[PDB]
Design a binder for these strands. Structure first.
Ligand SMILES: [Mn+2]
Ligand SMILES: [Mn+2]
Ligand SMILES: [Mn+2]
Ligand SMILES: [Mn+2]
Lengths: 745, 745
DNA sequence: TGAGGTAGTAGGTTGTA
DNA sequence: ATACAACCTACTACCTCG
DNA sequence: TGAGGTAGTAGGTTGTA
DNA sequence: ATACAACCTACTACCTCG
């Protein structure tokens, strides 16, 4: 079969134990906690010792050769203690830091083209490479002609076993930067009005946007009583303004909004942020050029990390440590266990389907009851476009028709739609002011001949005249009428296109219309393992000090939604309080009792991220009710990527392919072919449970393959995925009594 | 008439300009901002100069005699600059700080009983007095026999005019403290299990509760590797443990929960917090003894501040400055303007009412439509008590009956209640687990013969077997059935009492039942001034990092509710974002358009607290729609209190009595007689508007006198008051479509 | 949580820079 | 890191309401 | 916002103490 | 005051779907 591996390189040769020099930090300042200063003390005494290696075990610093203990620092009185030879088996992290330091020190000495420093080292886990390995396996710089710079960003994280052998886990990424700040942009005469900027001179994390470009020079005395050059010389920062020429002093003051007040910052400091939007807006030839370099399949990631490890070479400071240039043949040698999960078979109307595409030729599993009356808002410029769009939607849904042609892929009467254009309402709304949009939606609900809305909003792009999605969905949220919004572009593709691209869009629209009115298109034949209900959980942070309420979806064992609950109070942080947990799981058990007459004997809780809560509360609440339960953390953001092997040819893994060790497991949920990127697998780990992980992974991969919003599978299981979508549609909840209508989809 | 005054004393004699010594602070540390350190530098160099006066103008410190500039401080390099004589007219705040410093320095020198320091000075605006002036005008200490200490807390805030005369604004308050920490409590053998505590040795603001009392001595080496006495000697705090005897070292370690981890703190540090609960639980004779001393009418506040000013006496450091012992005869001499607002006449069913009590003999203004069917949950122990309670409620509401006796204060058919005990449901619920309460409420709504619930919850006091109010109101919130909850105590008073106290309780219950089903009991005849709709606004902070959503009520000009809106997203801080403002005022204008066919030509916005928002957004939004608007900040917490004068006899003012200067005005909204406390007036100020303040105060006092939840007036206007109650009932909003049913009441 | 007011305790948010 | 000033909030007593 | 995946950028929360 | 580590979120490109 196709064995699996991760982005890891076995180190030939082992790390011998080294002579360490142990240091001591005490809280000399007005504080006394060494733990609030210990990493900063490491950084300061590391940089002040010509970047010689400085380590951290819990309070004891370590160096590899002799450094004088420093009393010059105001906050930390670092002192020598002893010299010793620490064993590996108690100090895994320290020897890992040793290996990644010596990798950083070998990669500073590596030059490309004989002239240029290849890797930008800051002696950390991150190694920026100034040049990239291309698809054609040639080290070439990628700079735009507008100075935009692409850099291949590496994160090393080596692991040393108890014996001393080294396993180097790599992860490669891209980076956007530029060598041109606002000073060279105004020297080029470019307009920076309204750009977001990142001031390179301060570590202040925040989003700064330019207000204007003042006519005042940076050397002239400003509104603060002094010039900005004098302002930086007063702040012990005259070194930044020391090398300024007269032409540098002719610079225009660029005032910048800084989330509390208009700052006045000089343009030699402010590098413009390189968003993907910014690359697309300013150099779209370069921006579309690098989609083969940013999005990487497993073969090109293996080639990039192969070039990286060949750049490392032998490390003579660790007993001639040299890494292999190949991945592992199998992760059983790494301690993982691998496999492919069987595909979850689905049910439609008249039986099993061999993919998600056959269901419009088969019919949906659970119809809703009763007629649904379309009633559509449309912008007044886009009349015939909207009419042809709803014509295509009604042809697909009710009449089984496509372009006026009956089609063998589609059965008649998919949804019992009562839409007659002679009797329906096509309310037209002026694009413009927001209260006109809200009055337009209330004007559509001023009639009783509508049960569903297919309102045409303008595009979510095109920042001009105001979008209608948010006011429409807020009003239809208050009125409890479900609605499937369509952008103008999709309406124009329904009107104008003659290909099956409109068939794809119409598939996803009709699945949305079905899911919003309570229908269920397809269900699982048999879920694997002993389970009665799946419960999702997620708490998302929208902005600073914001937390989305702990939205929890509840599924049955066949995967259809039972109940979702949003607590009306916002909670403190992404740990859930026990009051909110009690309310959520009371809704869980009462909803499953309402649909099936008993408490569920087995719960699998998928928590999106960290299950930070009291496990004792869960033990209490499901021990007083005799419920076995499982908490399986589904985690999205993971730098680990999974590969495949067929006679050594590294390629992207199939959907449903996984790796497993103990109580954590990574699983590829989506089939992405080459020239589109790598599969970004989930991190799935069990914080508490008594089920084996093969069952929990089969359950999660089954809850990925039953996303009822699209003909293609969701990466997330729809437990955490639908919790995430309720967190996105957090202001769009239907006001009236909570149903199984998947409004958020 | 009865003139008005505030708690202010005119200073006989004026402050001459003084010779100031000006200092300079620079950011010597790793920061450079003087503004983040300037007050701490003032405090440090004030305490290090034997508490000689140290002032703050924006960055320039001032002293009154010569102090050597200090370089010993690590963070601030304070330096002498110059000696000068500053004028008062540019330095109001500095001479105010001078006057309050010399008041602190005179009051340190004042002894009571010839022996004891009367006032506990920390050289600030707060002056704790160790003794109290009693009701009988005798300076007597108030200590419990359990060591609980009552202290009369004074806040001085003198104001100097441009000429130099001093006006001393006083405010007196009470204080709870004790001289007995956990060490003397365990020496007395008292149980401290579960108490909240305030550790006196750290400035860390947080709520600490005791877990247990360990058998480990504080001198024995603890779980941290060292003893706690060694832990405090390592933290430069051996002075706190220096004077410990052997008996002090026999102390038991009292571990304490500290919101992240169990701290281990020694009992000589932890003073127990003196809540009013704690005084009531431990010394209820003392706790009920001091309700004449804490709650102060205006006469006793005038006597207490008279004793305070007589304790100040002459100040020879300010040209023999001496204060008067009397208030002002009128606040026109202070620059305010006073008066009493006319009482807003009300409408019932058959005409005007002369108070709120006549409406049950008159009938309500707006009935609801259709029968309301009571259906009641009751705890199973309290069957006949609940039956007699609902009997009294149904007798009052439908039959006009009281104790089986028709009464001239009550007209028949107050609410069209269809409650027949032979046909209704009395569902009984077991006191206990919370999901049983939720299943009990869903079991009551399993029938369709109920439109309103009068469920009997257990008491909100009595921490034992779990309360039912929160699960009941959450379930009836989801199901959109309004419900008037009644505690067991009020049910027992309905069952057992024969007096008119049950008539009072039944008044407020029937007003609640009317308000929850959409009825409006009484409305204003004519609101004063040009106004079409009142809009409330409030954003409350529940806990750390929590913000209640920006709940906004909308009233008409007659005061009945139109619409309330809760944005489903929680916002960042108690400033409202412009997105949320646009959504709120779109609901405002569309709701008033739905009820009256046009946009309102005049809006008076009552914002609870600070109108921190973009005034430019309001100018934009109501200039593009041709709406004059007013933002009148209604502010609750105010230390200022208002008095009255009748031949010098100071007494509490009537409700609707106000003082006014410019764009801020204080107004007494409630008539509180003597022996019950002082009226706590609103602070009402106009951040933007074009109405005179007499009109806005008449509007606010009219919106206090039409609270439809009680027979006695609300202190707040019900704009900010009902916004506050929706913030309290933030998880109790009815799920279904938002109506004018005042659910929160 | 009959309703509301006074009164404490604790704890935040925001401005003022 | 810091700190008062106005403002808030919650929780518990007490007290009263023809 | 047809739907979803990859990919960047920025920015938080929480633990680990 | 501090800082990385795993985790998140939002917003914009690109790309593809019988
Ligand atoms: Mn999330
Ligand atoms: Mn959708
Ligand atoms: Mn509030
Ligand atoms: Mn109530």
């Amino acid at each position: 079969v196709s064995n699996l591996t991760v982005e890891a390189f076995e180190g030939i040769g082992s790390v011998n134990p080294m002579l360490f020099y142990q240091y001591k930090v005490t809280g000399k300042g007005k504080y006394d906690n060494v733990y609030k200063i210990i990493k900063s003390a490491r950084y300061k005494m590391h940089s002040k010792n010509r970047f010689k290696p400085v380590f951290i075990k819990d309070d004891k610093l370590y160096t590899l050769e002799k450094l004088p203990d420093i009393e010059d620092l105001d906050f930390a009185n670092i002192n020598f203690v002893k010299s010793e030879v620490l064993s590996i088996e108690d100090n895994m992290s320290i020897y890992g830091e040793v290996v990644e330091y010596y990798i950083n020190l070998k990669l500073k000495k590596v030059k490309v083209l004989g002239k240029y420093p290849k890797y930008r080292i800051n002696y950390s886990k991150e190694i920026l490479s100034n040049t990239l390995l291309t698809r054609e396996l040639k080290d070439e710089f990628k700079k735009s002609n507008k100075g935009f710079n692409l850099k291949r960003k590496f994160r090393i994280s080596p692991v040393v076993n108890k014996m001393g052998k080294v396993i180097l886990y790599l992860s490669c990424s891209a980076d956007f930067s530029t060598n041109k700040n606002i000073y060279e942009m105004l020297k080029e005469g470019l307009e920076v009005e309204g750009l977001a900027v990142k001031s390179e001179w301060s570590n202040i994390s925040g989003n700064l946007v330019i207000e204007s470009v003042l006519e005042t020079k940076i050397s002239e005395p400003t509104s603060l009583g002094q010039s900005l050059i004098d302002y930086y010389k007063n702040n012990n920062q005259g070194y930044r303004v020391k090398d300024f020429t007269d032409e540098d002093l002719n610079a225009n003051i660029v005032n910048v909004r800084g989330n509390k007040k208009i700052y006045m910052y000089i343009p030699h400091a402010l590098k413009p942020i390189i968003t993907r939007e910014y690359l697309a807006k300013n150099d779209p030839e370069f921006s579309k050029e690098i989609e083969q370099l940013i999005k990487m399949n497993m073969n090109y990631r293996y080639e990039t990390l192969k070039s990286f490890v060949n750049d490392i070479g032998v490390i003579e400071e660790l007993n001639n440590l040299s890494f292999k240039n190949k991945y592992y043949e199998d992760v059983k040698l790494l301690g993982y266990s691998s496999g492919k999960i069987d595909e979850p078979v689905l049910m439609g109307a008249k039986g099993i389907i061999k993919n998600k595409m056959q269901i419009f030729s088969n019919g949906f599993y659970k119809l809703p009851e009763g007629k649904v009356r379309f009633g559509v808002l449309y912008p007044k410029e886009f009349d015939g476009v909207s009419r042809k769009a709803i014509r295509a939607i009604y042809d697909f849904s009710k009449e089984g028709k496509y372009h006026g042609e009956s089609n063998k892929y589609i059965a008649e009467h998919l949804i019992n739609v009562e839409f007659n254009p002679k009797e329906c309402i096509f309310e037209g709304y002026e694009l413009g002011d927001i209260t006109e949009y809200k009055k337009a939606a209330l004007k559509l609900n001023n009639y009783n001949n509508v049960d569903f809305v297919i309102a045409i909003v303008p595009n979510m792009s095109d920042e001009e005249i105001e979008n209608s999605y948010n006011p429409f969905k807020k009003i239809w949220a208050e009125l409890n009428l479900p609605s499937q919004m369509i952008s103008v572009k999709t309406a124009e593709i329904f009107a104008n296109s003659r290909d099956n691209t409109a068939l794809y869009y119409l598939h996803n629209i009709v699945l949305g219309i079905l899911g919003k009115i309570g229908g269920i298109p397809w269900v699982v034949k048999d879920m694997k393992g002993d389970v009665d209900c799946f419960v999702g959980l997620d708490v998302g942070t929208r902005e600073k000090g914001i937390h989305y309420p702990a939205c929890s979806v509840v599924f049955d064992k066949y995967g259809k939604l039972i109940n979702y609950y949003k607590p009306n109070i916002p909670q403190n942080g992404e740990k859930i309080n026990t009051e909110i947990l009690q309310e959520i799981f009371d809704k869980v058990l009462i909803s499953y009792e309402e649909e099936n007459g008993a408490y569920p004997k087995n719960i699998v809780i998928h928590r999106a991220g960290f299950s930070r809560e009291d496990l004792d509360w869960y033990e209490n609440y499901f021990g007083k009710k005799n419920i076995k339960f499982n908490i399986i953390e589904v985690k999205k953001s993971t730098p680990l990527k999974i590969a495949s092997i067929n006679e050594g040819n590294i390629t992207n893994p199939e959907k449903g392919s996984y790796i497993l060790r103990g109580n954590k497991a990574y699983m590829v949920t989506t089939d992405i072919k080459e020239n589109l990127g790598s599969p970004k697998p989930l991190k799935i780990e069990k914080s508490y449970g008594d089920i084996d992980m093969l069952t929990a992974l089969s359950q999660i991969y089954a809850l990925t393959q039953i996303h009822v919003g699209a003909t293609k599978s969701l990466r997330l299981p729809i437990t955490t995925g639908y919790a995430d979508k309720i967190c996105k549609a957090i202001e769009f909840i239907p006001q009236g009594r909570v149903d199984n209508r998947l409004f958020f989809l």
